[PDB]
Design a binder for this molecule. Structure first.
Ligand SMILES: [Ca+2]
Length: 1239
């Protein structure tokens, strides 16, 4: 008979010349998550695929799983397929067409109309493909992107897919190049106020079969204004450009007193370049520009446009919380807004190129961007074997037609040059950061690094002379040689040197040791706090309740608290600024509950997001935020109190005394307390700041009274000890002249109060009007208050959102790290009294009513209006058609097409109307191949794909591999094989008789039967899946990379040199004639004092994935003796506090490795350790000296990596497939469904 695909919503997508040069291409893509499918061919039946609008993250929608890794948010990646079908109007004949991706994470492969264009590994750099050569003009075309985010690939939540805008560029054959215009104003600093010299260079490509005679007409005018407001023009002399050649065309414009781009006044200009042949304009290319200049002085730091500025910076990862990696413009904009309110003036794009959207935002909003291109270089971090390290140094394939950067060297060059090409004209970008902690979390020699650095520096210099390059190095603090060489070379090429995690003392060491260097804190603080937690005042370690104090006393081992990292910076004019880790919490890296390896950390649900943020994933500030504001925002006055004032949440100690903290930019603060129901405020105390100002003119405040904190940095804020009592702690603020600061004008909580029980929801939306573009967002904060409207400190009431109208709920969040509730749910628990709902617009104007509801609490309701995009027609238009477009008919039978199809309109109305289908050739009916059929409805042309089948021999069998503990995902469908060799692109839905999930919890092969009914005839298919364990490979020692190596033994009773045990040598110096041994460590001293044991502890700044430990114990004649078997013990932790015994096997080697050195090898399954404490117990023997001792020359802590290997072969053995390949009866398919070899 015939079978038909189920009815899908068909959107008609069209590319004509009526469209703008570059057009949004985000809409109407089909997506499918599938490790197995092959969807490259335009014929493929994508009817059953999910329709999505880009940008889109396909990781964020999958479910959390302990088999994944903490760093990457316990969320999976895998293989995603995007397909989009569209007509190219025949008016585009002659024109050139290109597709542009701003980001695709990661390992993208692109086909156009079945032709494979190429690949792009890196997940954050932008890239392009030409479609011209392969386009079918006046016809149906199909672009296909295959995204393979094979984990592990990130130390943070990557997300997966096309997470950033796609566009189409249509141009004449003679056109300005990709990112073709480069603007320089070499003298602006000098010319400022007068006429400014602009030097343009423009790549003009002649992609025609004829030499071309071209002139450029360039015009600089204010962005958003008309050309007649230009402040400069030029028209070039004729340049002849040969056929299929291109040329760089230099021009100069004189700008009539351009308005400077500044932080306060981010004035932008447009620079339009027209390509002229004869009279006619062939191409017109705009680029956004700002007039601005920077300077770096090694003593007085940074300056913008002549004024001295302090870089008050945050590091920001790319994800947008509950929305995942999706680079939604408004999401991104909102982040910047919140940061600006904090007093931020700079963002470091840690550790990868930003979305253009961010750059765009920063350009208009006036924020300095340090755009970082890379994290790791040629060596991967944290055993993320699939991270860009894999690709950094690889050459580009000859057949790879990817575009955007230089293809003549490595991916590194391409990705770097591509990013610079995109952003070269952006006023906001002040520096190119070329790497981050390049030598952290890696293995093997680093001697190559300084050379790799220079290579990158050179490339950058050549790519963009106009901005200093930089990096963020965390071994400057360790005085590594490599780190020093690299900074000289930075300095030598006009770079600024970023030190990560330096204390004040170290900042000073650098200046003295490196006077040439201009330095900043490239990454600072890394303080770890949750929002609204007050019941303790300590942290920096794994808590029982999976949260951390909001007081600024909690930080990682390598970092420091906010007070500290700012204090160390503000005081030193020569430390140009700070880039705090981080501005906003990000998904992944849940330090102190971090995991570089597979498995849950603590009890599940484990924390899945960060604690570093000043602001949580939802955009709710933590308390520390108001500290930063107090220190950074000179356009507001901060006066903020913590903690919240309820019995159950405060931290009582020293007789009911609770540390009350105040953050403020005021000169004097009087703190009052009012007992409940009373109306009389009792003054608890009064404190005055000291307003110091540095030589360069940066002015800060410290408290220097008698009750000042002993540790200096804590005096950047005020702390009182109030006794706990129901009531209201308020504070009033006075300026330098002792004039009171008005009660209204303060920012932050001017008073905390004891609250009632949870009573009402108050819900407010950030914007009451948004654009009806399917893009814009409204952010709805919901607080849980008592009867009087006081936010309830510990409220965790599950709130349910009812979204009705011209919108839809796209996310819900609370910024709670261990909450695993779906982001894409209609409900979520409040956390510390707050919950967020994100609502997105539709493409039709209307109203959105959103209702926050919770059990036993007064509902709240907000109204949001969506306004239509200017120029959308009020008269109703055709939207889409609902019908089945795929028909498989038996040969000799006429195709039975439907008489009618459901039509949708802009109104959302649905009318079923009739279709007049084209005639089907008699030849075609018995032809036994595929063809398309046109019809017409409501003026528009619909199409249907028909494939004719004579007979089907069988359906191809399937084979895969799965990790033990993870059930195999079986294919939705299987392809058809003719009695003829030929394998069809026609797939038929299979129903599997699935075994229990438990079957996959042991190693072995597993057969699963499944059957599909094809033209009434049921066919029998076997899926033979192989369940496998990880393949673990042990690496080299990382003892060298230790952040710290301490000793149990007190200072006075230590003997020999400890640091010797990570020096990479195993032998003992015989050290005859006394003195401390430089080659080895011992406990001789402590032993003599009668101490039986000793504890050596390695600390790391990143969790190490250990796979083996080898201890090189030694012996002498007098005292030191090899320890007894099984007595030496190892332990591991994530914080330095909570320990765990390493389950290991000891092997004492047969022979000594070197005279009087024997290696004890400890074996164990891979485990993550940020700390490793070896407890050495002396032998139970007697010695000539009568003192028994233990001694070590080296402790090698070897790392390990795990892969899940899936085989590649189509060959046969015993029939059976060699690499568990699918046997079909013999055509075969490898375990990786890539190579099918028929024999
Ligand atoms: Ca050694």
């Amino acid at each position: 008979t015939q079978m038909s695909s189920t009815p899908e919503v068909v959107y008609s997508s069209a590319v004509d010349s009526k469209q703008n040069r570059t057009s949004d291409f985000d809409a109407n893509w089909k997506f499918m998550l599938s490790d197995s499918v092959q969807a490259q061919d335009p014929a493929f039946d994508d009817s059953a695929w999910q329709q999505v609008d880009l940008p889109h993250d396909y990781s964020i929608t999958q479910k959390y799983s302990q088999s994944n890794e903490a760093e990457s948010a316990y969320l999976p990646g895998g293989t995603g397929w995007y397909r989009k079908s569209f007509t190219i109007d025949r008016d585009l004949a002659g024109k050139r067409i290109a597709i542009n991706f701003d980001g695709v994470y990661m390992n993208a492969t692109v086909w156009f109309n079945g032709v494979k264009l190429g690949t792009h590994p890196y997940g954050y750099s932008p890239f392009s493909f030409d479609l011209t050569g392969n386009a079918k003009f006046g016809g149906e075309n199909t672009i296909v992107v295959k995204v393979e985010n094979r984990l592990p690939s990130s130390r943070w939540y990557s997300g997966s897919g096309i997470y950033r805008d796609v566009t189409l560029t249509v141009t004449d054959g003679v056109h300005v190049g990709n990112n073709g215009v480069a603007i320089k104003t070499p003298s602006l600093a000098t010319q400022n106020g007068g006429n400014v010299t602009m030097n343009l260079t423009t790549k003009v490509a002649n992609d025609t079969k004829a030499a071309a005679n071209i002139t450029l007409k360039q015009t600089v005018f204010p962005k958003g204004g008309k050309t007649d407001a230009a402040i400069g023009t030029v028209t070039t002399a004729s340049k002849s450009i040969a056929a299929g050649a291109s040329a760089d065309v230099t021009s100069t414009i004189t700008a009539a007193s351009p308005k400077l781009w500044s932080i306060k006044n981010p004035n932008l200009y447009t620079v339009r370049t027209e390509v002229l042949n004869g009279g006619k304009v062939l191409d017109t290319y705009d680029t956004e520009y700002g007039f601005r200049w920077t300077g770096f002085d090694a003593t007085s730091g940074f300056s913008l446009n002549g004024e001295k500025v302090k870089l008050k910076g945050v590091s920001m990862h790319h994800d947008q919380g509950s929305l995942g990696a999706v680079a939604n413009r408004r999401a991104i904009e909102r982040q910047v807004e919140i940061l600006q309110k904090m007093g931020v003036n700079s963002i470091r794009t840690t550790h990868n190129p930003a979305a253009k959207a961010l750059i765009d935002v920063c350009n208009e909003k006036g924020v300095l961007v340090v755009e970082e291109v890379f994290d790791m270089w040629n060596r991967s971090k944290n055993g993320n074997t699939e991270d860009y390290g894999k690709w950094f140094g690889q050459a580009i394939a000859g057949d790879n037609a990817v575009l955007g950067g230089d293809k003549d060297e490595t991916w590194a060059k391409f990705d770097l040059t591509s990013t610079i090409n995109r952003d070269r004209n952006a006023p906001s970008v002040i520096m190119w950061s070329l790497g981050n902690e390049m030598m952290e979390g890696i293995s093997g020699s680093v001697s190559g690094f300084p050379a790799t650095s220079a290579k990158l520096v050179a490339w950058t210099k050549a790519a963009d002379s106009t901005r200093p390059m930089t990096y963020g190095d965390n071994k400057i603090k360790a005085n590594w040689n490599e780190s020093n060489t690299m900074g000289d070379n930075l300095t030598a090429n006009g770079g600024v040197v970023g030190t990560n995690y330096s204390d004040g003392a170290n900042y000073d060491k650098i200046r003295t040791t490196h006077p040439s260097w201009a330095i900043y804190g490239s990454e600072t603080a890394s303080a770890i706090n949750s929002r609204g937690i007050y019941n303790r005042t300590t942290g920096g370690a794994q808590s029982s309740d999976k949260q951390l104090t909001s007081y600024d006393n909690s930080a990682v081992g390598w970092g420091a608290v906010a007070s500290s990292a700012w204090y160390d910076v503000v005081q030193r004019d020569f430390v140009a600024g700070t880039y705090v880790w981080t501005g906003f919490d990000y998904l992944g890296e849940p330090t102190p509950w971090n995991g570089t390896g597979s498995g849950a950390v603590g009890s599940w649900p484990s924390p899945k997001n960060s604690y570093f943020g000043i602001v949580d994933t939802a955009g709710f500030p933590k308390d520390t935020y108001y500290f930063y504001q107090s220190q950074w925002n000179d356009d507001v006055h901060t006066l903020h109190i913590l903690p919240a004032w309820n019995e159950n949440v405060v931290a009582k100690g020293s007789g009911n005394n609770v540390p009350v903290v105040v953050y403020t930019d005021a000169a004097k603060v009087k703190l009052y307390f009012t007992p409940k129901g009373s109306t009389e405020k009792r003054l608890i105390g009064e404190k005055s700041f000291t307003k110091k100002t540095t030589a360069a003119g940066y002015t800060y405040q410290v408290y220097e009274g008698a009750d000042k904190d002993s540790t200096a940095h804590k005096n950047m804020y005020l702390t009182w000890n109030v006794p706990w009592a129901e009531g209201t702690i308020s504070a009033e603020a006075y300026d330098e002249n002792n004039r009171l600061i008005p009660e209204g004008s303060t920012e932050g909580n001017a008073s905390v109060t004891t609250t009632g029980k949870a009573a009402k929801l108050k819900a407010d939306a950030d914007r009451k009007t948004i654009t009806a573009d399917g893009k814009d967002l409204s952010y709805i904060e919901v607080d849980v208050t008592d009867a009087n409207g006081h936010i309830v400190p510990d409220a965790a009431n599950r709130v349910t959102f009812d979204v009705k109208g011209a919108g839809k709920l796209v996310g819900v969040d609370n910024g709670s790290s261990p909450d695993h509730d779906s982001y894409q749910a209609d409900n979520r628990k409040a956390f510390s009294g707050k919950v967020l709902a994100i609502v997105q617009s539709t493409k039709e104007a209307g109203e959105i009513t959103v209702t926050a509801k919770a059990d036993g609490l007064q509902s709240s309701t907000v109204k949001i209006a969506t306004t239509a995009v200017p120029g959308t027609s009020t008269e109703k238009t055709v939207r889409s058609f609902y019908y089945s477009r795929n028909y498989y008919v038996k040969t000799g039978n006429k195709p039975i097409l439907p008489s009618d199809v459901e039509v949708r309109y802009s109104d959302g109305t649905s009318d079923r109307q009739n279709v007049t289908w084209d005639a089907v050739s008699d030849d075609q009916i018995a032809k036994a191949g595929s063809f398309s059929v046109a019809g017409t409805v409501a003026g528009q042309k619909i199409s249907v794909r028909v494939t004719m089948i004579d007979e089907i021999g069988a359906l191809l069998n399937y084979s895969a591999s799965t990790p033990v503990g993870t059930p195999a995902v079986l294919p939705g469908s299987r392809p058809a094989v003719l009695p003829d060799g030929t394998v069809t692109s026609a797939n038929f839905a299979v129903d599997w008789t699935k075994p229990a999930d438990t079957v996959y919890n042991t190693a072995g092969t597993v057969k699963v039967p499944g059957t599909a009914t094809v033209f009434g005839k049921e066919f029998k298919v076997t899926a033979t899946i192989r369940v496998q364990r990880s393949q673990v490979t042990i690496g080299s020692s990382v003892s060298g990379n230790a952040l710290r190596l301490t000793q149990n033994i007190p200072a006075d009773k230590q003997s020999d040199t400890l640091d010797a045990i990570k020096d990479g040598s195993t032998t003992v110096d015989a050290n005859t004639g006394g003195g401390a041994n430089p080659s080895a460590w011992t406990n001789w001293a402590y032993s003599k004092a009668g101490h039986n044991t000793a504890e050596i502890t390695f600390e790391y700044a990143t969790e190490q994935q250990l796979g083996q430990i080898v201890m090189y114990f030694f012996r002498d004649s007098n005292a030191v003796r090899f320890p007894d078997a099984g007595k030496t013990k190892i332990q591991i932790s994530a914080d330095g506090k909570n320990w765990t015994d390493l389950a290991a096997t000891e092997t004492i080697a047969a022979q000594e490795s070197s005279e009087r050195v024997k290696p004890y090898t400890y074996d164990f399954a891979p485990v993550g350790a940020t700390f490793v404490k070896v407890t050495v117990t002396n032998a139970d023997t007697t010695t000539p000296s009568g003192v028994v001792c233990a001694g070590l020359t080296e402790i090698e802590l070897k790392t390990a990596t795990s892969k899940f290997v899936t085989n590649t072969s189509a060959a046969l053995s015993s029939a059976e497939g060699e690499g568990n390949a699918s046997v079909t009866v013999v055509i075969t398919e490898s375990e990786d469904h890539v190579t099918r070899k028929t024999f």
